[PDB]
Write a protein that binds this DNA or RNA. Structure first.
Ligand SMILES: [Zn+2]
Lengths: 78, 154, 99, 60, 204, 128
RNA sequence: GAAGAACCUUACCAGGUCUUGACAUCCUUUGACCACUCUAGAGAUAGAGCUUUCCCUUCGGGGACAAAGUGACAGGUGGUGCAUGGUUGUCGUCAGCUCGUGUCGUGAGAUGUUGGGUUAAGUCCCGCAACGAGCGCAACCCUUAUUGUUAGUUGCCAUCAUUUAGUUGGGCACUCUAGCGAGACUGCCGGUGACAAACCGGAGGAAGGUGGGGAUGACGUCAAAUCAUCAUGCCCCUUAUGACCUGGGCUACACACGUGCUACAAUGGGAAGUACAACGAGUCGCUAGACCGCGAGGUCAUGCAAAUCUCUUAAAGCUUCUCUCAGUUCGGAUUGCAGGCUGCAACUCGCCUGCAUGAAGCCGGAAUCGCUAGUAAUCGCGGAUCAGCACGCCGCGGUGAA
């Protein structure tokens, strides 16, 4: 029941709203699992926390179909 | 089992065809105890008998039991303790048991396409010296009197 | 009419002796009562394993028995109303009046 | 360790899907009745006590 | 360990439930309250050495009833013990409450108290042999038919476990019309955890 | 009016047999043996208390049986039939005793045990 | 074991902080507090707004603190099952094991407990220097196997009225519910059998020889297993083997193995229309009834605190055309698109509908297990904790052999 488009939680959503009005920084130390991606975020960078360390990784040009937690894996197979 | 001879646990007669070897074969073909579909293929098999070259359904089973009949019984058993196999006479309930068993053995896997083609044609075939009931009758007539004399004390 | 009661307790003794007491206080001061019609005694089971650390493969079961009754009174007298409004013991059978 | 965890259910929930259940006298979160507020084996021994009203061993 | 309580095999058959209740939809709160009050019984059990405590419920009067040999060790003398227990129990309950105290009948027979007494001799370095033998002596002086009594564990305050126990008379368990008494106590002064177990026979 | 008592009891299926001396009517809740029961609706299985003693009439029956599959509420009919033919005579009842169909077969499903998966079906056991 | 893992249930890994600490008997103004809102965050929270605010007065007292901070600390989910309890698996419902008294042997001990037949049965007799007794089997507990009294609502309709329909008048005539009953006890007869128990057979009896099942695990064997339910012996952390907050984790895979679920097809494959169960659960939950809706989805709302209403018309059934043995009109592993649901959100790590879809498999070698009858074998429903969740478990209910 998240069919109503955008979903970024509040004390991350105000941070990324402040990112929309300013120039694109990198690191946010947060859950990085819940906030979904939607096309007003093209080109940004928000740190994705795998569980070990946050991964400051750039938000791409064509990401809408998932959330932050696809960049950093949850298993890190090697 | 070990103690003594077990009680016999007999069968019940049909209401329509009024028989029990028939009823034991009804149970021998019946899978999951589903009677009604098996009942329809029973009446259809007797109607394939009765019309296609058929005089009577009791008569066709008597013609079967002419040619079906298990007559002997080899028995691979030791008392002294070695690979010993004795041909012995067949018990009368076991005779009917092996007869209906051969009927289901060759009517089950004859190889004809529709499910009661092979059933109805084999219960036609057992009446007149055909079917694997006759093949196993040849097996019974052949392998007996051969491996007897070493296990002759049984 | 305007008084009929359900009677919930456990075993054979409590429901029928308290039903005898209340029907006797009913038709002692009045009349108009049926019998304490029995009810099918609700039950649901329980399940506990037989170990302290391991062994799902050995359980132990439990049950519940709670018989129920039914007493109708059709348009009573005010003196069995006096028997109703003051006799409210024991609490094994439930103090319970309805429509 | 578990004293903070027993105190965890006494503290109010952060959102809806954080409310969990455990026993009262012990604190086992597995096999805990929501009707009895017991765990399994403590209900077992308290049934051998016969201090629980109702419940008896059954056999039919 | 494979034995089953005959007091659990015959509960609700020849004996009765503690919580003589019927509590539809408000059920486990009062029984965990029963657990709370059961934690509080150490004050009465200090002097009087009670055996059974039976609890019912009025509208608001929490009808509780105990059983012991000494009323003056649990009533005070005119209500000195009783009102202090009312206050300390009202702090547990916040409701009407009524204690009830009944004289015991042959305190020699009380299988909780027999195990309590032999554990009491085990608290202060008394040999188990003469203790359990004088237990069956006073059980013969209690008057019975057959008594088994078992102890298990680190006997003599020592190393790896022993378990032997005395037996006299005649005592079956297969009978359902028996009403045999049973109690597991501690056996612990400074070493781990042990206990005694008793099996008397008296007839139905 | 006239009506004759009868009821049946076997395998989660209770009957209401109600005989009048007639020609043969068998409609459970106004549903015939070919309306209620499907094609395996053997008359001699049902009317075998007629079919082996006092054969056959038949006689008209108001019948009301309910419960379980077709065979189970067919086997629970013969008690009311024996009550109705008993209201004719106990003279035929000695023949019923010698021909059976009176001793109620109590064979129900055996009770399962908590600890297995059926009443007797064990584990598909390995080598060990 | 874990009877329901997105944090949480997590014992583990990464970060941020306190280490009289979030968790214990006193220390201050006793405070009246925690409370609700603001900047921030991932928050422990730092700061704040707010006072968060005195609950008898016999001239006093103490009945109440939120940090604040102190030592006794306090907190251990760290280990030793080989210090342990308690509890549990196994031989195993196997059929045994002892005691008192009298006796034989110098003695340690033996005897009873012994030879026949007889049994689930160390069950019972006949012989026997033993006599007997106790713990054992069994019965006394439950359910089913027929039925009397007692009583009729929502159970159930009988002469009948109501009438689509037990619907409302009437009622307990069927059933039904539960108190007590009665009955089944080798009870009876006949035969075999020393006339001993036992067996064979029959009457009668609903049930015959422990009627079919469940409770019932004797002494002891296995240092079996459990310090993580509980808490103790001993050892140990005790600015951490104590903690709060954000994510992962037990579910990723180079392999081997177990228990299972479904196909490998014409007792089918599809279409159409035609019926019967029981245990439960349901008041903030079963949903009565209404529609859109291929469907996940919503629609306004009634009854239901329970023989009233639902889940629940049970499916497995009938009767009519189809395909003629085909990797297929069997089969759905399979991954993308469009949606939807509980949660607040479902890549991580839930469930469901449509779309793409027909892959393997055409009966499984060596090998083994289970089963002497409503059993095996097959098919539906109910339920345990359950924000949501089962091919799991515990039942019920149908069809029915060798
Ligand atoms: Zn518990």
């Amino acid at each position: 029941s998240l069919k109503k488009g955008p979903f970024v939680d509040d004390h991350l959503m105000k941070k990324v709203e402040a990112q929309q009005g300013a120039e694109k920084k990198k690191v946010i130390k947060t859950w990085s699992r819940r906030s979904t991606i939607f096309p007003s975020f093209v080109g940004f960078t928000i740190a994705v926390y795998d569980g070990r360390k946050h991964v400051p990784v750039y938000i791409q040009e064509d990401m809408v179909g998932h959330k932050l937690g696809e960049f950093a894996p949850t298993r890190t197979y090697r | 089992p070990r103690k003594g001879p077990v009680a016999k646990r007999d069968v019940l007669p049909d209401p329509i065809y009024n028989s029990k070897l028939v009823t034991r074969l009804i149970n021998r073909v019946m899978v999951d105890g589903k009677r009604g579909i098996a009942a329809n293929i029973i009446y259809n098999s007797f109607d394939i008998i009765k019309e296609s070259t058929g005089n009577d359904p009791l008569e066709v089973f008597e013609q079967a039991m002419k040619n079906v009949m298990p007559v002997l019984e080899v028995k691979a058993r030791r008392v002294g303790g070695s690979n010993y196999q004795v041909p012995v006479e067949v018990r009368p309930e076991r005779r009917t048991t092996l007869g209906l068993r051969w009927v289901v053995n060759y009517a089950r896997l004859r190889g004809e396409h529709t499910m009661e083609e092979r059933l109805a044609k084999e219960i036609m075939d057992a009446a007149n010296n055909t079917g694997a009931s006759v093949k196993k009758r040849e097996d019974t007539h052949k392998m007996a009197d051969a491996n007897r004399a070493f296990a002759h004390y049984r | 009419q305007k008084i009929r009661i359900r009677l919930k307790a456990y075993e054979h003794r409590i429901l029928d002796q308290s039903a005898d007491k209340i029907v006797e206080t009913a038709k002692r001061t009045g009349a108009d009562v049926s019998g304490p019609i029995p009810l099918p005694t609700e039950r649901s089971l329980y399940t506990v394993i037989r170990a302290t650390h391991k062994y799902k493969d050995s359980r132990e079961q439990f049950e519940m028995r709670t018989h129920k009754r039914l007493i109708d009174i059709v348009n009573p007298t005010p003196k069995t109303v006096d028997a109703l409004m003051k006799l409210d013991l024991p609490s094994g059978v439930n103090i319970e009046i309805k429509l | 360790a578990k004293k903070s965890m027993i105190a965890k259910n006494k503290r109010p929930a952060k959102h809806s899907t954080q409310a969990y259940t455990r026993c009262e006298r012990c604190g086992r979160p597995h096999s805990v009745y929501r009707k009895f507020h017991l765990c399994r084996i403590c209900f077992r021994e308290l049934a051998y006590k016969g201090q629980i009203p109702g419940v008896k061993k059954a056999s039919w | 360990g494979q034995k089953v309580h005959p007091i659990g095999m015959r509960v609700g058959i020849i004996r009765d439930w503690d919580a003589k209740w019927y509590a539809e939809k408000e059920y486990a709160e009062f029984l965990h309250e029963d657990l709370r009050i059961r934690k509080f019984i150490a004050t009465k059990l200090a002097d009087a050495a009670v055996s059974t405590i039976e609890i019912e419920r009025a509208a608001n009067r929490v009808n509780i009833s105990i059983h012991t040999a000494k009323p003056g060790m649990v009533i005070g003398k005119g209500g000195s013990e009783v009102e202090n227990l009312r206050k300390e129990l009202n702090k547990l309950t916040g409701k009407r409450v009524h204690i009830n105290i009944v004289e015991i009948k042959k305190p020699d027979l009380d299988a909780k108290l027999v195990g309590e007494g032999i554990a009491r001799q085990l608290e202060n370095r008394v040999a188990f042999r003469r203790a359990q033998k004088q237990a069956i002596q006073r059980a013969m002086r209690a008057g019975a038919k057959g008594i088994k009594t078992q102890v298990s564990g680190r006997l003599n305050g020592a190393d790896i476990a022993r378990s032997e126990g005395y037996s006299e008379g005649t005592v079956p368990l297969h009978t359902l019309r028996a009403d045999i008494d049973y109690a597991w106590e501690e056996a612990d002064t400074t070493y781990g955890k042990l206990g005694v177990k008793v099996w008397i026979y008296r007839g139905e | 009016q006239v009506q004759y008592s009868g009821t049946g009891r076997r395998k989660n299926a209770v009957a209401r047999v109600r005989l009048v001396p007639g020609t043969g009517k068998i409609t459970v809740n106004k549903k015939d043996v070919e309306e209620y029961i499907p094609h395996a609706d053997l008359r001699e299985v049902i009317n075998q208390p007629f079919g082996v003693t006092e054969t056959k009439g038949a006689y008209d029956v108001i019948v009301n049986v309910n419960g379980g599959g077709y065979a189970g509420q067919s086997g629970a009919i013969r008690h009311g039939i024996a009550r109705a033919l008993l209201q004719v005579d106990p003279d035929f009842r000695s023949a019923l005793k010698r021909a059976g169909l009176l001793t109620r077969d109590a064979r129900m499903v055996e009770r399962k045990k908590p600890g297995l998966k059926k009443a007797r079906k064990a584990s598909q056991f390995s080598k060990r």
